[PDB]
Structure formats: structure tokens, C-alpha cells
Write an enzyme that holds these catalytic residues in place. Structure first.
Site, PDB file in Angstrom:
ATOM      1  N   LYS A   1      -6.975  -3.650   7.088  1.00 59.46           N
ATOM      2  CA  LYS A   1      -6.738  -4.112   5.730  1.00 59.46           C
ATOM      3  C   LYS A   1      -5.367  -4.759   5.587  1.00 59.46           C
ATOM      4  CE  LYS A   1      -7.243  -2.627   0.986  1.00 59.46           C
ATOM      5  NZ  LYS A   1      -6.996  -1.515   0.038  1.00 59.46           N
ATOM      6  N   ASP A   2      -4.398  -4.350   6.407  1.00 59.51           N
ATOM      7  CA  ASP A   2      -3.088  -4.986   6.404  1.00 59.51           C
ATOM      8  C   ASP A   2      -3.084  -6.289   7.191  1.00 59.51           C
ATOM      9  OD1 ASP A   2      -2.178  -2.875   4.885  1.00 59.51           O
ATOM     10  OD2 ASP A   2      -0.781  -2.098   6.367  1.00 59.51           O
TER      11      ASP A   2
ATOM     12  N   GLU B   1      18.177 -21.154  -7.592  1.00 57.97           N
ATOM     13  CA  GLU B   1      16.765 -20.962  -7.284  1.00 57.97           C
ATOM     14  C   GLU B   1      16.096 -20.039  -8.307  1.00 57.97           C
ATOM     15  OE1 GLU B   1      15.366 -21.849  -3.634  1.00 57.97           O
ATOM     16  OE2 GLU B   1      16.709 -23.459  -4.256  1.00 57.97           O
TER      17      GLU B   1
ATOM     18  N   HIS C   1       7.827   9.301   5.516  1.00 61.76           N
ATOM     19  CA  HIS C   1       6.988  10.062   6.432  1.00 61.76           C
ATOM     20  C   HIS C   1       7.027  11.565   6.165  1.00 61.76           C
ATOM     21  CE1 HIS C   1       5.684  11.411  10.566  1.00 61.76           C
ATOM     22  NE2 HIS C   1       4.854  10.401  10.382  1.00 61.76           N
TER      23      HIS C   1
ATOM     24  N   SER D   1       2.200   8.964   1.383  1.00 60.13           N
ATOM     25  CA  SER D   1       2.163   8.004   0.291  1.00 60.13           C
ATOM     26  C   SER D   1       1.663   8.621  -1.012  1.00 60.13           C
ATOM     27  CB  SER D   1       1.272   6.817   0.658  1.00 60.13           C
ATOM     28  OG  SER D   1       1.808   6.088   1.741  1.00 60.13           O
TER      29      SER D   1
END
Ligand SMILES: CCCCCCCCCCCCCCCCCC(=O)OC[C@H](COP(=O)([O-])OCC(O)COP(=O)([O-])OC[C@@H](COC(=O)CCCCCCCCCCCCCCCCC)OC(=O)CCCCCCCCCCCCCCCCC)OC(=O)CCCCCCCCCCCCCCCCC
Ligand SMILES: CCCCCCCCCCCCCCCCCC(=O)OC[C@H](COP(=O)([O-])OCC(O)COP(=O)([O-])OC[C@@H](COC(=O)CCCCCCCCCCCCCCCCC)OC(=O)CCCCCCCCCCCCCCCCC)OC(=O)CCCCCCCCCCCCCCCCC
Ligand SMILES: CCCCCCCC/C=C\CCCCCCCC(=O)OC[C@H](COP(=O)(O)OCCN)OC(=O)CCCCCCC/C=C\CCCCCCCC
Ligand code: HEC
Ligand code: HEM
Ligand code: HEM
Ligand SMILES: COC(=O)N(OC)c1ccccc1COc1ccn(-c2ccc(Cl)cc2)n1
Lengths: 79, 378, 62, 64, 239
Positions: B226-227, B270, B200, B204
Site C-alpha cells: 500500500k505504501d 514561494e 516504535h 501507531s
């Protein structure tokens, strides 16, 4: 202190916009979209694909030489 | 007098999710950060159910898990939501790390370093959850960790005995593995709030690698819708793997119970640990193999120091893009080798691919950025 | 310039967004009991004569 | 009863006869001398793998 | 230790994505475990309780439990007594100990079967291909006291005489009880036993695909509506 009125300095730039209710949500979809996603594929195919080809050739050589080291014995199997 | 700008609790939410300035050219590769927050919440409201009906002992562990799929109501759906929900977490984590490696997001130094801590904590958690069902893969996979954990030259023999409940395979082994698995997912939830508080401070990064302060948009409604769409596409893939093939990601030999009865036909974990098991198995020394295991994850911290390009991301660097996809094809090779037996072609391949993973990050990537610097006349 | 049938009930129910706040509750029907046309008539058609309630008259009132 | 007759025509496939004939060509090789442990589990695996492929394609029609 | 033989793919009637199990072939295959076996195999996780509604109604179900006699607990003015099937009982094991188990079978314990097709790399195709795949030991393979040559076994040397042949059994409604028909029905059993959620898993997967065929094109066009402001904008620079 990162809010919208305090970000950067800008001069002499004009923008024009339309309302979402005044336009159609699906413009040219197969007229523009299909020629667009094909030159995007052409622009990145020589960077991404040749590493994954070399994985394929090593995988085939590695599973085929595993079997004829094990119990596959035509002619080296004498006294 | 606007209540979402002046209320003490509402103004924290408004600065974080609603009025947050965001770049306008953010791609679908920036969706996987909120997908990791959905997968972590889902593994908490499903691990509630399993630890309720559970008993962890050497005599009843293998049957405590088979009680849930047949007798416990809605237990087959919740168990395989939990086993496939952890495979979903690990595919959303490898996409997330490879994004920040490709676009140079590691230049956010404090956000990147808390991320490397988050990658260690979920890897150690999931190791202590596959030991809980107590089958053949649970036993022989745990008993190759302690061979390299007792190789610590001073404190190692009393370290493994303190975590095995006290002696060896016994009742109380699965009281310290189970304790180290109930509580580690909540340190992850607190380390994720700190992870976002450091992001923050700058906002971004974007796919061009150029600062975007002249072209910001609000987060609501553009990236809130969009998320939500990207999370709906994740629930479709997860419920397809649960309701149509719930044993596709798994091993049948972990349905054979645990006992030192007989040596198994193979030993494999795995799919999301097969790259790491292939590296330590190609080192014939139980101290050199435990050092290269930790050096395969903590090598990410050297990525800010090894950067020699004048640009930030890889969008305009064609020679560096070739090396990034050679590294992805090298991790596919190690995932395949790590499920193969230790025979003739899979030792020379599995140990040259262990070398090339370190040669690309340390040597080949810093030299190639310098060569591209000279070609652009800086 | 006659329009199409997309003036659904926009002047009647949908303008004042009174509908939008409570479509989890009010505008919620037509998609459980009207979908008896859906999966159960399809799933029993692929599996005709294989479920239990197909082989059922053979084993009651004997 | 349907298996023992479905398995009969699956042997005259040309992929199954040359998996059968050098199984029996190695039969008179093991009981010939004393200096051998040349077993015939490799020669019989290729017979059964070539044979039981075509049995699975046809057996379930004659059942239930 | 040299190679292995893997089972082929049989076209089962539950092989498809929306395919149920045949609920007449589970009834016929339960008796291939009940009356042809349980002399070696326990199945300690399935009861007589779980058979109701799948292949039997609840009468026709208790009568198979009031047929075996197993030891109950004690009662005062007495000791350990016998009381047969109380409608909720696991299937009876043959051997009192692994000590007496492998001594009856020349040093081998035949395993439990309630998870045997989920525990092998062939599913129920492996169990079928080993029950009907017996051969004679070939030239050079000198096997010991208790070894019958099965090519679909790890180690070629299972301690298993062949259990099933033509008419070891006859079914309740009338069905030719040949060897492959015996094995096909018991392999429609032991898969329902491993996975009793099979038909509920595929019917719930069908309503999932129909609801997300509604939600997904409708969230996408809502996203498309908000983002059209930015997709249609124009820029100009007038210094
Ligand atoms: C650590 C993290 C802990 C969090 C974990 C979960 C715990 C939840 C929690 O903390 O509860 C906090 C709890 C509610 O938290 P929340 O619901 O999760 O969200 C915080 C909201 O900002 C709280 O909304 P508000 O209190 O600011 O609302 C002010 C007022 C003003 O609202 C209005 O009148 C309408 C104005 C538009 C509001 C638009 C908001 C923007 C979206 O609202 C009303 O008059 C009626 C409320 C409307 C219905 C409520 C549902 C809407 C939310 O906050 C309080 O207890 C407020 C104190 C109440 C004391 C009242 C004293 C005066 C009498
Ligand atoms: C270029 C390569 C990276 C350069 C490293 C510097 C920037 C990264 C950083 O600061 O992360 C610190 C932190 C490591 O730095 P450090 O040893 O804690 O402090 C010495 C430094 O000079 C850092 O000291 P400082 O200048 O940051 O002093 C303030 C320090 C002190 O402030 C606090 O941490 C407050 C203490 C929290 C109290 C609440 C506890 C709740 C329980 O604040 C922090 O270190 C917090 C950042 C890490 C969050 C961990 C706190 C848990 C929440 O990063 C990590 O979390 C692990 C990465 C370690 C390797 C990176 C450096 C080797 C290259
Ligand atoms: C390990 C086990 C396996 C992990 C999962 C592996 C996932 C398979 C990855 C295959 C996905 C291929 C994506 C295809 C899209 C594509 O490549 O197009 C190229 C496209 C070009 O776009 P730009 O660079 O912005 O423009 C440049 C113009 N010259 O490139 C991109 O999209 C950027 C790639 C973003 C990275 C996202 C993650 C990629 C997955 C790689 C996994 C690597 C994991 C590394 C982490 C290791 C942690 C221990
Ligand atoms: C002749 C006694 C006997 C009969 C009857 C018998 N088995 Fe077995 N079988 C054995 C023994 C002994 C083993 C264990 C061999 C070993 O562990 O080496 C075995 C092993 C198995 C295995 C494991 C094979 C493997 O690859 O590990 C399966 C599956 C099996 N039996 C199924 C069945 C079924 C189904 C029936 C009923 C049709 C049955 N058996 C009847 C003797 C028998
Ligand atoms: C539980 C694990 C994690 C969670 C919940 C999480 C969450 C998030 C979220 C929500 C974002 C912002 C949105 C986005 O860009 O996707 C983000 C960004 C970021 N994360 Fe993570 N993350 C996790 C793990 C990691 C790891 C393992 C790393 C790196 C080693 C990492 C490094 C970063 C970086 C560098 C960014 C900023 C990227 C950019 O803006 O370009 N995170 N994370
Ligand atoms: C980051 C979150 C988590 C991850 C990656 C994770 C991973 C796993 C894995 C791999 C298994 C093994 C399943 C199997 O092999 O069948 C498992 C099961 C289990 N988990 Fe978690 N888990 C998480 C969260 C939790 C939580 C929050 C709890 C407790 C409240 C928990 C407790 C358990 C228990 C008791 C089991 C055993 C039950 C079973 O094996 O089905 N886990 N988990
Ligand atoms: C789901 O669990 C498994 O796959 N487990 O463990 C029960 C298993 C099972 C069988 C064989 C091996 C393993 C484990 O193999 C590895 C290889 C590397 N790690 C590891 C673990 C923790 C950390 Cl921090 C870093 C690396 N684990």
C-alpha cells in the site's frame, strides 16, 4: 517487547477467512461502491464545506474593493 | 534457525518493517510519512548534481544557474526536479501535521516534539536555497529577514554581519547561506531515525482513537504494497509538473537578475512561506513581527497541554471538526494575503486573520472540548 | 464447466515462481521496440510539418 | 497589413463603441480650463482592453 | 502607478500540451533580432552554436557568424586583433558600458532578451502585445523628451520609439513581411531562446503517461489481491 504473542488477552471470538485465489478481486464495485461513497459524502458535508464558503465570499469582496479604491473613478473626480 | 529472526542486522529490519504489528483500519492519511521519506531522499540525489556545477558569488550566481538549463547536459530536468520536489515536500508535510492534529497523535509526546524540530529545520533550509539563485525575489526576501534579525536588541547587529560573509551583499554572503544549506538536510536524516525509534515504543494511532491491540496485522505484505502504490501516484504528479508545466510554481521576477538596480514591482516568496510572510507584515514593529513569526510554528508544542477532551481523536466530535476546518480556511486566507500588495483591504483582512489563527488554538478549542464533555454526561 | 483463457501458461512456466525472480531481466521485452507504435508516431502526427526532419528535403542536396 | 484591417471591424462591436465614445467625451474636458490634471489613461485602457480581446481571437488565421 | 494593461491570450501553435514549436517560424524570427535589432539588446546566453538543427543546418549557420566582426584576444608579435565568428560565439552587445548605454537612450538601458519572456508576467504574449500596441499620448499626459506612450508598459512611459513597421526586412523563402508577421515570428523566437527544452519536454511527457498507464492498474490489482483476505472475513462471538 511488542511482538505478536504478547499483546492482549482475548476469549470466545471466532474468525472465518477465504483464500485470495478462491475469490474474485473485484466484487460489487458500482452496485455497492457508488451508494457507499454518496452517504459518506452526505455525512461530512456540513462540517467541511461551510468554512470554505466564507473564504470565497471574503475573496470576492477583497478583490472587487481593491479595484474601485484604485484607478476606477466615475463620479468622485471633480474640483 | 530462521535467519531473519537471529542474524544481528536482519533482525533489526524484521522488527521495523516486516513483523511489525500494525492496526488494520489505517487509512490513506497514514501514507504521507513514507512519502516524506521519499521526498527527502530525492532532494539529496538531485542536490548532488546542482552543487557540483555551482559557484556562489555576487557576480556570477545568476549565471551559474542559467548555465545548467542550457549547457549542462540533463540539467533542465534535474533543476526543475529540485525546485518542484521541494514544493512536493511541503505539501506532504502540511498533510502530515494536520493528520496528527486531527486524530490526536500529539499524545505521543516524544514523537511529536521531535516533529516540531523537524518542521523548523526544513523551513530554514529552504529559505537558504531560494537565496542561492540571486534574483529579485532572492534579494528583497532575504533583506526583510535581516531587518527583523537586527531588531534583536543586544546581539543582532553582529549576528547578521557574521552570517553575511562579513559586510553586506558581497562574494562571501553565498558561502554561509550555501554552507547552511548543504549540511542541514543531513541533520534531518538523523533526526528521522530518532523520530521513528520513539514511535516504535507504542505503535501507531488509528482513526477511531481507541487502542487496537486485539486487531493487529503484520506490516508485510499489507502496508508494504500500500505504501508502494501511494509512492507511484506521487511520482506521477511530480513528473507531470516537471514535464508539462515546470514554471507553474514560481515567480517570473526571479528571472530578472539581482542587483540593487531598482525596487521590484512586488515582493513575495514561494507559496509555502506566504502564510508566514502575511503575519509578520501585518505587525508595524520589527520586534513584535519577529516574535509572532516564531510563535506561529512553536505553538504546536502546547497541543498536549491544551487538550481537555475525554476522547483522543476527532472522529466522534462534530463541534471540534467545524473548528478544525475553520483553521484550514484561515491558512488559505493568509496564503492569498501574503501575495497581495500592502493596500487598504489587505491590511484589515491580513491582521484579523492573524488574530484568529491564535484564537482558535488557544481559546476556542479547549472550551469547545469541555462543552462536548458536558453533553455526553461525563 | 469449460474454463476461460486465463490458464495462460500457469502449468508451463509460472507455477514454480522461477519466472518471478527474473522478470526484470528475462520477461522484459515486447515493450521498447514493439512500442514504436506508441509515442513517437503519435507525437509527430500532432506536429506534422513542424519538426526539423519534416522540413529537411528542402535544404539538403541543393 | 492584416492587423490594420482586422482591427477595423473590432471597433463596431457594441462593447467597444461605448468604450470609445466617453473617451472622446472627456477630450473636451481636459483642454477646457486650467485647474485640472484629469488624464485620459483610464478612458483609453477600457477601449484597448475591450478591443484587443477580439483581435487575438481572429488575427492568427490571416498569418503564417 | 494607477492601473496596468495585461496582454490577452493568443492562440500560439505551441500552446497545447503535446504541441511542438514551428521550426520555420524560428528561422524567420531569428532575423528579426539579427538585422532589425541588436542595436539595443545583447542576448548574452545564446550562441551561434545552438541554432543548428532547430532552424538551420550547420552550413547556413557559420556564414551568419562570419558576417559580424568582434574583437578577439591578443597575440604575441602584435596586440588585440580581430578574428570573426568561430562557430561558438554569443550575440554581440551594442553598448560598451551602462554609462554609454542610457546616454544613448535618454536615461534608460534596454535589457537583455535571452530570458525576457521567462522574466515577465505575460510570457511571449507580453512581448507581442507591446511591440504592436503603440498609441498616441492622450489628453493631459504631458510626457517629457524621451517618452513614447505605450499602454502595455509599467508606468505608461517607455523610452522606446517603435522599432518595427511594414518591410523593415524580407525573409529568405518569400513571405509577406507585414508588421504583425514581423512580431509573430520574433515572438516564436525569444521563447525558444528562453526555453530551448520545449519540444523535448513534451515528447518525454508522452512516454511517461503511457508507461504509468501500464504500471498503475497493475500494482493496484496486486494490492487488491492481498487485501481480499481481510475484506471477506467474518466474526462471531460465542461466550
Ligand atoms: C548504518 C547503516 C549502514 C547500512 C548502509 C549500507 C551498508 C550495507 C551494509 O551494511 O552491508 C552489510 C552486509 C549486507 O547488508 P544488506 O545486504 O544490506 O542486508 C543485510 C542482510 O541481512 C545480510 O544478509 P545475510 O548476510 O544475513 O545472508 C545470510 C545468508 C543466508 O541466506 C540464505 O542462505 C537464504 C535464507 C533466506 C534469506 C531471507 C532473508 C530475509 C529477507 O545468505 C547467503 O548465504 C547468501 C546471500 C544471498 C544473496 C544476498 C542477497 C539477499 C539479501 O552484511 C554483511 O556484510 C554480513 C557479514 C558478512 C561476513 C560473512 C562472514 C562469514 C563468511
Ligand atoms: C507534555 C509536553 C512534552 C513533555 C516533555 C517531556 C517528553 C518529551 C521529551 O522528552 O523530549 C525531550 C526534548 C526536550 O527535553 P530536554 O530539554 O532535552 O530534557 C529535559 C526533559 O526533562 C526531558 O528529559 P528526559 O527525561 O527525556 O531525559 C533523557 C534525555 C537524555 O538522553 C539523551 O538525550 C541522550 C543524549 C544523546 C547523545 C547522542 C548525541 C548524538 C550527537 O533524552 C532526551 O531528551 C531525548 C529526547 C529528545 C531527542 C533529542 C536527542 C537528539 C537525537 O524534546 C525536544 O526535542 C524539543 C521539545 C522541547 C519542548 C518540549 C517540552 C516543553 C513542553
Ligand atoms: C497552508 C497552505 C495549504 C496547505 C494544504 C491544504 C490542503 C487542503 C485540504 C483539503 C482536503 C479535504 C479532505 C476531504 C476529506 C474530508 O474532509 O472528509 C472528512 C473526513 C471524515 O473522516 P473521519 O474524521 O475519520 O470520520 C469522522 C466522522 N464524523 O475527515 C478527514 O478525512 C480527516 C482529515 C485528516 C487531516 C489530513 C490533513 C488535512 C489537510 C489540512 C491542512 C492543515 C495544515 C495544518 C498544519 C499547519 C502547520 C504550520
Ligand atoms: C528605439 C530604440 C529601440 C528599439 C530599436 C528597440 N527597443 Fe526595446 N526598448 C527601448 C528602450 C530604451 C527600452 C528600456 C526602457 C526603459 O527601461 O525604461 C526598451 C524596452 C524593451 C522591453 C522591456 C519592456 C518592459 O516592459 O520592460 C522589451 C521586451 C523590448 N524593449 C523589446 C524589444 C524588441 C523585441 C525589439 C526589436 C523589435 C526592440 N525592443 C527594439 C528601445 C528600443
Ligand atoms: C522530515 C520529516 C518527517 C518524516 C520523514 C516523518 C516520518 C514519519 C513516519 C514514517 C511515520 C510513520 C507512518 C505514518 O504514520 O505516516 C510518522 C509518524 C508520525 N509523525 Fe512524522 N515525519 C516527519 C515529520 C513530522 C512532523 C513535522 C510531525 C509533527 C509536528 C510529525 C509527527 C508524527 C506523529 C505524531 C506520528 C505518529 C502518527 C500516528 O501514528 O498517528 N512528523 N512520521
Ligand atoms: C530537505 C532537502 C532540500 C530542500 C527543501 C531544498 C530546497 C531547495 C530550493 C527551494 C532551492 C531553490 C531552487 C530554485 O529557486 O530554483 C534549492 C536549490 C539548491 N539546492 Fe536544495 N534543497 C534540499 C536539498 C539539498 C541538498 C541535499 C543540497 C546539496 C547537496 C542542496 C543544495 C542546493 C543548491 C546548491 C541549490 C542551488 C541550485 C539551484 O538553485 O538550482 N539542496 N534547493
Ligand atoms: C523560498 O525562500 C523564500 O520564500 N524566501 O527566502 C529567500 C523569501 C523570498 C522573498 C520574500 C520572503 C522570503 C522568505 O519569507 C519568509 C517568511 C517566513 N520565512 C521563514 C523562513 C525560515 C523559517 Cl525557519 C521560518 C520562516 N521566510
Amino acid at each position: 517487547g511488542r511482538e505478536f504473542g504478547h499483546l492482549t488477552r482475548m476469549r470466545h471470538v471466532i474468525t472465518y477467512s477465504l483464500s485470495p485465489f478462491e475469490q474474485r478481486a473485484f466484487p460489487h464495485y458500482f452496485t455497492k461502491g457508488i451508494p457507499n461513497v454518496l452517504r459518506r459524502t452526505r455525512a461530512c458535508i456540513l462540517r467541511v464545506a461551510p468554512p470554505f464558503v466564507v473564504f470565497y465570499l471574503v475573496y470576492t469582496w477583497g478583490t472587487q474593493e481593491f479595484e474601485k479604491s484604485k484607478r476606477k473613478n466615475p463620479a468622485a473626480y471633480e474640483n | 534457525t530462521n535467519i531473519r529472526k537471529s542474524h544481528p542486522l536482519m533482525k533489526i529490519i524484521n522488527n521495523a518493517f516486516i513483523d511489525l504489528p500494525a492496526p488494520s483500519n489505517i487509512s490513506s492519511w497514514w501514507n504521507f510519512g513514507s512519502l516524506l521519506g521519499i521526498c527527502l531522499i530525492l532532494q539529496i540525489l538531485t542536490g548532488l548534481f546542482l552543487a557540483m556545477h555551482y559557484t556562489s558569488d555576487t557576480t556570477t550566481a545568476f549565471s551559474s544557474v542559467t548555465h545548467i538549463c542550457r549547457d549542462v547536459n540533463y540539467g533542465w530536468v534535474i533543476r526543475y526536479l529540485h525546485a518542484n520536489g521541494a514544493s512536493m515536500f511541503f505539501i506532504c508535510l502540511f498533510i502530515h501535521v494536520g493528520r496528527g492534529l486531527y486524530y490526536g497523535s500529539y499524545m505521543f509526546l516524544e514523537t511529536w516534539n521531535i516533529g516540531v524540530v523537524l518542521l523548523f529545520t526544513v523551513m530554514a533550509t529552504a529559505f537558504m536555497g531560494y537565496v542561492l539563485p540571486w534574483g529579485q525575489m532572492s534579494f528583497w526576501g532575504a533583506t526583510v529577514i535581516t531587518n527583523l534579525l537586527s531588531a534583536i536588541p543586544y546581539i543582532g547587529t553582529d549576528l547578521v554581519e557574521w552570517i553575511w560573509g562579513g559586510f553586506s551583499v558581497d562574494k562571501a554572503t553565498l558561502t554561509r547561506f550555501f554552507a547552511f544549506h548543504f549540511i542541514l538536510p543531513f541533520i534531518i536524516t538523523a533526526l528521522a531515525a530518532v523520530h521513528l525509534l520513539f514511535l516504535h515504543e507504542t505503535g501507531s494511532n488509528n482513526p477511531t482513537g481507541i487502542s487496537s491491540d486485539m486487531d493487529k496485522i503484520p506490516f508485510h505484505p499489507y502496508y508494504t504494497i500500500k505504501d508502494i502504490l501511494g509512492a507511484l501516484f506521487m511520482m506521477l504528479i511530480l513528473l507531470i509538473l516537471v514535464l508539462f508545466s515546470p514554471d507553474l510554481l514560481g515567480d517570473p521576477d526571479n528571472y530578472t537578475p539581482a542587483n540593487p538596480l531598482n525596487t521590484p514591482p512586488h515582493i513575495k516568496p514561494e507559496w509555502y512561506f506566504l502564510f508566514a510572510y502575511a503575519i509578520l507584515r501585518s505587525i508595524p514593529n520589527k520586534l513584535g513581527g519577529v516574535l509572532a513569526l516564531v510563535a506561529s510554528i512553536l505553538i504546536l508544542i502546547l497541543m498536549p497541554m491544551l487538550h481537555t477532551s475525554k476522547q483522543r481523536s476527532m472522529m466522534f466530535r462534530p463541534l471540534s471538526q467545524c473548528l478544525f476546518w475553520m483553521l484550514v480556511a484561515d491558512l488559505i486566507t493568509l496564503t492569498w494575503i501574503g501575495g497581495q500588495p500592502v493596500e487598504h483591504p489587505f491590511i484589515i483582512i491580513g491582521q484579523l486573520a492573524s488574530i484568529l489563527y491564535f484564537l482558535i488554538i488557544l481559546v476556542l478549542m479547549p472550551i469547545t472540548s469541555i462543552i462536548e464533555n458536558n453533553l455526553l454526561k461525563w | 464447466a469449460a474454463p476461460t483463457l486465463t490458464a495462460r501458461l500457469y502449468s508451463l512456466l509460472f507455477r514454480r515462481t522461477s519466472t518471478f525472480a527474473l522478470t526484470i531481466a528475462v520477461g522484459a521485452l515486447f515493450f521498447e521496440r514493439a512500442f514504436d507504435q506508441g509515442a513517437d508516431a503519435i507525437y509527430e502526427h500532432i506536429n506534422q510539418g513542424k519538426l526539423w526532419k519534416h522540413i529537411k528535403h528542402k535544404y539538403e542536396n541543393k | 497589413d492584416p492587423l490594420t484591417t482586422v482591427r477595423e471591424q473590432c471597433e463596431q462591436i457594441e462593447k467597444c463603441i461605448k468604450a470609445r465614445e466617453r473617451l472622446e467625451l472627456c477630450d473636451q474636458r481636459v483642454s477646457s480650463r486650467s485647474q485640472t490634471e484629469e488624464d485620459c489613461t483610464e478612458e483609453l485602457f477600457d477601449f484597448l482592453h475591450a478591443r484587443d480581446h477580439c483581435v487575438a481571437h481572429k488575427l492568427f488565421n490571416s498569418l503564417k | 502607478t494607477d492601473l496596468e494593461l495585461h496582454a490577452p491570450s493568443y492562440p500560439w501553435s505551441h500552446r497545447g500540451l503535446l504541441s511542438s514549436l514551428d521550426h520555420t517560424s524560428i528561422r524567420r524570427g531569428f532575423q528579426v533580432y539579427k538585422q532589425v535589432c541588436s542595436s539595443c539588446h545583447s542576448m548574452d546566453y545564446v550562441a551561434y552554436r545552438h541554432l543548428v538543427g532547430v532552424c538551420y543546418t550547420e552550413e547556413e549557420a557559420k556564414a551568419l557568424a562570419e558576417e559580424v566582426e568582434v574583437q578577439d584576444g591578443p597575440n604575441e608579435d602584435g596586440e588585440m586583433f580581430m578574428r570573426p565568428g568561430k562557430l561558438s560565439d554569443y550575440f554581440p552587445k551594442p553598448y560598451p558600458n551602462p554609462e554609454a548605454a542610457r546616454a544613448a537612450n535618454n536615461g534608460a538601458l534596454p535589457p537583455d532578451l535571452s530570458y525576457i519572456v521567462r522574466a515577465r508576467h505575460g510570457g511571449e504574449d507580453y512581448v507581442f502585445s507591446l511591440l504592436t500596441g503603440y498609441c498616441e499620448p492622450p489628453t493631459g499626459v504631458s510626457l517629457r523628451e524621451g517618452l513614447y506612450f505605450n499602454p502595455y508598459f509599467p508606468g505608461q512611459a517607455i523610452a522606446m520609439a517603435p522599432p518595427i513597421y511594414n518591410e523593415v526586412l524580407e525573409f529568405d523563402d518569400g513571405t509577406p513581411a507585414t508588421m504583425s508577421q514581423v512580431a509573430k515570428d520574433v515572438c516564436t523566437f525569444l521563447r525558444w531562446a528562453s526555453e530551448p527544452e520545449h519540444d523535448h519536454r513534451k515528447r518525454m511527457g508522452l512516454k511517461m503517461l503511457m508507461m504509468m498507464g501500464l504500471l498503475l492498474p497493475l500494482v493496484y490489482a496486486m494490492k487488491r489481491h492481498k487485501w481480499s483476505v481481510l475484506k471477506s472475513r467474518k466474526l462471531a462471538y460465542r461466550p
